[PDB]
RNA sequence: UACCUGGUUGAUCCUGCCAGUAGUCAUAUGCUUGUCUCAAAGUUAAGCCAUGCAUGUGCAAGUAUGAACGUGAAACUGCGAAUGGCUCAUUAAAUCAGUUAUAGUUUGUUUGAUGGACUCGGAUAACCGUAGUAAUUCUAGAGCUAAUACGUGCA
RNA sequence: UACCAUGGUGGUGACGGGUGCGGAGAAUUAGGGUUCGAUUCCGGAGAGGGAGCCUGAGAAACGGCUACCACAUCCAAGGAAGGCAGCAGGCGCGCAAAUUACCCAAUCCUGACACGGGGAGGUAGUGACAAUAAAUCAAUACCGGGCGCAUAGUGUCUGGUAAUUGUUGGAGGGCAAUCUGGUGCCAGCAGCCGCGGUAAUUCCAGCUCCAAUAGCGUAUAUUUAAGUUGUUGCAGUUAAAAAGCUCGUAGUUGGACCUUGGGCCGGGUCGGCCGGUCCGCCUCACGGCGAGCACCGACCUACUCGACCC
RNA sequence: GAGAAGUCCAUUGAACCUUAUCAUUUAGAGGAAGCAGAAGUCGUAACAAGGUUUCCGUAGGUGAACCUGCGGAAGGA
């Protein structure tokens, strides 16, 4: 959540019953947007922003998986990319196609299964692509001790139920799998978001 | 109550004169009491040290005694601290030595190798000599003290921790007396019998 | 029940006994025992005669040592197979301090301790060969 | 033994049958009884002691507020207690002497020894020798 | 202490290796004992197919076959004669000969005590006993007593009175003595559990121990030995159990090192 | 480290138990505490309770505003008082744990999604003026007044 | 809730009875187990006892009602009136547990649009109920005794005096520690043993000895020891103990050889909260506390391989 | 068009009294002598082949310890 992760930042000293002015200053955005808002919740992706004379954060995870914030440079904060976490299912073809953040999206776009994942700016909410969870791209692992690395997906096994497990190659060192709650993906041959340093 | 554990550790180290054996027990704790008692240090405390020396893994003997440097074992080797319990202990209590830069006033710390052991500029210039030398001088005096003074049991020098007793004048004689007559009959005991 | 105590028992008997060999009917199981014993030297071979359509098998084992002492200080059983009394890869609780070797049907086949412990098996305990 | 450990239908016959057998004490304890128990007692009297050797010690009768009657016995030398009082009870064991489940240990009420040293918290007195006994008496008159 | 244990080789395996070495061959198996008879005949056979007899006496064969008269000798060891013991202490000096006779200047019962050297001897305990006869019941005494020199040995006597008995129970340790192997700094060489009677005595190497067994730890040359000896409180029976541990020591390396045989 | 030692006996060994000894609690007797420093803090009555007090917001939630001087403030409506706290009486149970099921179902508010500046009227509390069982607690006969709370026309 | 069917369950313990919250965890003990289940974290439950209802998104509501009963209260005595197992504090029960205190500064949350509120929570007062470190001695000169040298005297440590420098437990044995005075199986003592029957190693006092030492023992509870509930870790011939013996099951187990599957196994990847426990680092003078980091966790859930044995 | 006081049927469905019984804490009608303290009486059983060898199932019966009939045993000559 958004309070928890600014104030994150922060942890030299002196805020947190204060905490309610740095909101009201205005002086932080969520995904381009105002929001003063002390309850607010954050996740993953989402791009938070302060000054003015001023900065961009992206929040991960890091190794261990709690949230925090990195920072980010100014392109890659035009962009975000959404996981889709459910479907409802139609139409035309149009899944009602949730996504990690909480965003709805109904309709094309041409795809879309679960555990895809779709690239957005952010002042338009216009999809710029979609990164298909399939062997041969690449992702980011969301959760667990496995957390905070990276891998192309060499294979994805099937089963009843539910699709088990997604394996990687990668590693610098070597092979790991983990079911696919915990993948996020985040690049493709078209299109990577993938430049930040590695890793097991 | 540390001069006579002291007075003991003496006791042992020296001999001939008056004595019988011992017993299995006995050889397995006199050895224990020693050790403890140079550093002139509690019981609670070896023991705690000897707990953490038999859960650090290797060779059960040593560790304990490769890790009695400790800051009060070390001054010992250095020459500078004249016995470990020493005026030097004191002195450490006094904050006059120095562990990375840093200060520390407990002794039980430990110690561990490559440590550097100086004095403090500050605490070279005492600040209660000046107060002593100051009576003399342009006032009065009066000596001196060590004391065996007391104050509380009682005067005579030879005293307190301790001890010395005294309280001596009992006459203990009639309270006895006084329940052995006292306790007797009544109060017992419903026996019915004739001869 | 299974036979197991009785070659066991016959083997350290035998070696009191300073008899040259034993000898008692066997299967895959109870041979392999008998192999894990000859592939850690305990006896110098182990023969099945008659293995091929008659009633029955028996296993001439000969005993290694003759002389001095004997080989088999000591075996015991343990706790034989089908089975709990049961050990993890890891679990391996035991005698000697690696100067014996506990066989062990494993997972796999029947190896020794050593094997199954690198083999990345547990297994049943068989007996503590010393 | 007799099965040691194997599967199919088996482990807890030789469970139940262990708690059946218990020695001890079930049930953690009380058919008289436990815990500090202040029995305000009014008989005084003597009993004898168990088959190995005699004495005649002293003691006194109790009731307790936990409904039971028993003789206690009073450690250290001399005693007085009086309009009830309070004397309270450690239930303490002998392994055993006769109808003697119990001593009432030093409290309150319960006084200590005549004027001593030696001693003082076993067989007790007050500052420096007595003190306490003084104070102690005023206590239940007033 | 610990554990298994690891390092090194040949150096490690050392020490009391001698006893180790003569000791593995006498005990067992069919050279050895244990009753041997049967076993001779059975060794015949071989030993004629190896060396060979040349067949006149002659030269050679009157060599050969005392040389094999001498494992056949050397087999009869039954470990309450000196051998493997004797050759380790050390030894030479005139008093060697007075030991292996025959009553010189010396011996009657004695004669050993001087050449092993220096070394505590502590009174371990003290007991009573009390024995009812006609006119009256003699009070006794039986004293158990350890100095012990490097291997391990217990002794209890008796004697009427309590001073006599200890003074030839020193000897009486010493003389009769046997070296269990030590493999490690006073650790025992690989687990044991010894029993005579309704005692269940193991020992197993970890710390330091208590009672009438820990005494013993400290004279066999153990510094850190485990000894969990539970069935009887009574202390005669407590060390005698043990004494048995404490020189049929059967450790795998004991097994694998026998090839060899000695004049 | 853990390991034991006393008592069945004239004395012994074995069975076997009592008892000491070792550690420990959410506890008591307590004699006795110069000290820095943190900590437990009614498995007795889920007995019974006096006294203060444990929930508030209009400088962009809401039209209005007696009285106080655009600024504060009493009632109505919205959000809240169900969170939290504490006690294990009930309590062997799909109660709870751990794994799944849930399109067999809810989620207001919010984060997020989807839909979307003509004219208006209606009565009401505070404030008031008196009151009944009346010292009462309490609320009404009652003047006056304001509603993104209400009712509508509607691409 | 109608109608139709008469069922479903239990020698693998159903239905029933008693029990001085369940899990995360605590304490032990080398491991195994035993024990404990709680105040805290988590879930559930109830607010004097019990049912029902409105309100509100959400209540079947401690700080709402209704209202029978239980019990205190107010009364101008007609009628109202209450919920501390929430803080502080009373009462009595009992062995026994705190100020009728202070503050939202921190911490988190309710409120809403920006600063407001809180007995949530924190403080300080009380308080050796877990923890630890330090005193009080101590360092040093000089007379008197012993040990390293060699009548003596040298080198070194003690038993006192001179200078400067920052209490409680026991002492026959268990079990560690032999006076003197007084009593004499009387009185009292020891948790077993046993001591007192007049010169007491056991009472009691005082000296002395000493274990530990701002703590100690004593009792209760609990566990180890006690392989004395034994799985690891034991008996049943004379020690508690072999069923008088059989016929037979549900229930433990299974001689040889070949082959197929694959419930019992490796790698896994999820979860295994935090706290605590263990390592090590710093932070308040130190420490324990506390902070920050690391390392370990049974077992249980996906996936795939694998088959000797059941 | 809204719909107060209100009265009735049906349902969930409180509390006193009606059961009848079981449980707990208790006391208790009247009664039997199981163990025990040492300070008692009775006999002398068992204890040595115990002066009739012990013990045992079983019934009878005796002041009682016990006796004995029958059969069995050797922990018995």
Redo the contacts between chains.
């Keep these: 959540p958004l309070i928890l992760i600014i104030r994150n930042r922060l942890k030299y000293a002196l805020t947190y019953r204060e905490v309610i002015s740095i909101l009201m200053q205005r002086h932080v955005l969520v995904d381009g947007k105002v929001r003063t808002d002390k309850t607010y919740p954050a996740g993953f992706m989402d791009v938070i922003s302060i000054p003015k004379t001023g900065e961009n954060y992206r929040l991960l995870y890091d190794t261990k998986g709690r949230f925090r914030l990195q920072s980010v440079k100014d392109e890659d904060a035009k962009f975000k990319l959404c996981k889709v976490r459910s479907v409802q299912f139609g139409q035309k073809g149009i899944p009602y196609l949730n996504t990690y953040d909480g965003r709805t999206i109904r309709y094309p776009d041409p795809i879309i299964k679960a555990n895809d994942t779709i690239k957005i700016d952010l002042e338009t909410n216009k999809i710029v692509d979609f990164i298909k969870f399939d062997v041969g791209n690449v992702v980011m692992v969301t959760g667990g001790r496995n957390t905070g690395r990276v891998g192309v997906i060499k294979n994805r096994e099937k089963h009843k139920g539910s699709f088990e497990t997604i394996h990687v190659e990668d590693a610098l060192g070597h092979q790991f799998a983990t079911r696919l709650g915990n993948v996020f993906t985040i690049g493709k041959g078209n299109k990577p978001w993938v430049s930040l340093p590695k890793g097991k | 109550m540390p001069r006579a554990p002291r007075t003991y550790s003496k006791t042992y180290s020296t001999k001939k004169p008056r004595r019988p054996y011992e017993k299995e027990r006995l050889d397995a704790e006199l050895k224990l009491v020693g050790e403890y008692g140079l550093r002139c240090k509690r019981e609670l405390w070896r023991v705690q040290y000897a707990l953490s020396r038999i859960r650090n893994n290797a060779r059960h003997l040593l560790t304990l005694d490769e890790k009695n440097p400790r800051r009060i074992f070390e001054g010992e080797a250095l020459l500078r601290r004249m016995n470990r319990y020493g005026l030097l202990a004191d002195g450490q209590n006094k904050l006059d030595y120095v562990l990375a830069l840093t200060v520390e006033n407990f002794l039980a710390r430990r110690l561990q190798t490559l440590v550097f052991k100086a004095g403090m500029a500050k605490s070279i210039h005492h600040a209660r000599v000046l107060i002593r030398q100051r009576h003399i001088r342009v006032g009065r005096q009066i000596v001196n003290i060590p004391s065996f003074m007391v104050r509380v049991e009682s005067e005579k020098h030879i005293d307190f921790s301790l001890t010395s007793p005294f309280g001596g004048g009992p006459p203990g004689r009639v309270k006895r007396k006084n329940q052995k007559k006292a306790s007797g009959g009544g109060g017992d005991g419903e026996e019915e019998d004739e001869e | 029940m299974v036979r197991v105590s009785v070659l066991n028992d016959a083997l350290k008997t035998m070696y009191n006994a300073e008899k040259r060999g034993k000898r008692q009917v066997l299967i895959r199981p109870s041979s392999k025992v008998i192999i894990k014993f000859l592939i850690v030297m305990q006896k110098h071979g182990y023969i099945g005669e008659f293995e091929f359509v008659d009633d029955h098998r028996s296993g001439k084992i000969v005993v290694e040592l003759n002389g001095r002492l004997n080989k088999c200080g000591v075996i015991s059983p343990r706790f034989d197979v089908g089975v709990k009394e049961i050990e993890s890869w890891t679990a391996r609780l035991l005698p000697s301090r690696q100067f014996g070797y506990i066989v062990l049907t494993t997972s796999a086949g029947i190896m020794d301790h050593e094997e199954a412990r690198r083999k990345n098996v547990g297994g049943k305990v068989l007996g503590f060969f010393y | 033994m007799g099965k040691?450990?194997?599967?199919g239908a088996g482990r807890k016959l030789k469970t139940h049958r262990r708690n059946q057998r218990w020695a001890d004490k079930a049930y953690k304890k009380s058919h008289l009884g436990n815990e500090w128990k202040k029995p305000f007692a009014g008989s005084?009297?003597?009993?004898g002691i168990v088959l190995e050797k005699i004495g005649?010690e002293?003691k006194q009768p109790n009731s307790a507020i936990r409904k039971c009657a028993r003789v206690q016995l009073v450690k250290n030398?001399?005693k007085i207690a009086a309009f009830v009082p309070n004397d309270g009870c450690l239930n303490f064991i002998e392994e055993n002497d006769e109808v003697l489940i119990a001593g009432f240990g030093r409290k309150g009420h319960a006084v200590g020894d005549?004027?001593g040293?030696r001693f003082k918290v076993v067989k007790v007195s007050g500052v420096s020798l007595l003190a306490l006994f003084k104070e102690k008496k005023e206590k239940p008159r007033s | 202490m610990a554990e298994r244990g690891g390092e090194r080789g040949g150096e490690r395996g050392g020490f009391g290796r001698g006893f180790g070495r003569g000791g593995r061959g006498d005990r067992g198996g069919r050279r050895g004992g244990r009753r041997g008879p049967r076993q001779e005949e059975e060794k015949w056979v071989p030993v004629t197919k190896l060396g060979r007899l040349v067949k006149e006496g002659r030269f050679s064969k009157i060599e050969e076959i005392y040389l094999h008269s001498l494992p056949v000798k050397e087999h009869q060891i039954v470990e309450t004669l000196v051998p493997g013991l004797k050759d380790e202490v050390m030894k030479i000096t005139p008093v060697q000969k007075q030991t292996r006779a025959g009553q010189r200047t010396r011996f009657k019962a004695f004669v050993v005590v001087g050449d092993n050297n220096g070394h505590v001897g502590l009174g371990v305990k003290c007991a009573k006993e009390v024995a009812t006869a006609i006119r009256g019941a003699i009070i006794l005494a039986k004293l158990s007593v350890v100095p012990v020199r490097r291997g391990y040995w217990g002794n209890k006597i008796g004697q009427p009175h309590t001073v006599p008995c200890k003074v030839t129970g020193k000897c009486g340790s010493v003389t009769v003595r046997m070296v269990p192997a030590p493999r490690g700094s006073g650790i025992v060489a690989a687990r044991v559990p010894k029993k005579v009677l309704q005692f269940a005595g193991i020992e197993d190497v970890f710390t330091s121990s208590r009672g009438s067994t820990k005494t013993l730890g400290n004279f066999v040359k153990a510094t850190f030995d485990c000894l969990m000896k539970t069935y009887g409180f009574l202390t005669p029976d407590f060390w005698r159990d043990t004494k048995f541990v404490k020189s049929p020591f059967q450790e795998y390396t004991d097994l694998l090192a026998k090839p060899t045989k000695a004049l």
């Design positions: 040691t450990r194997g599967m005084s009297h003597a009993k005649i002293a030398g001399k005549i004027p040293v």
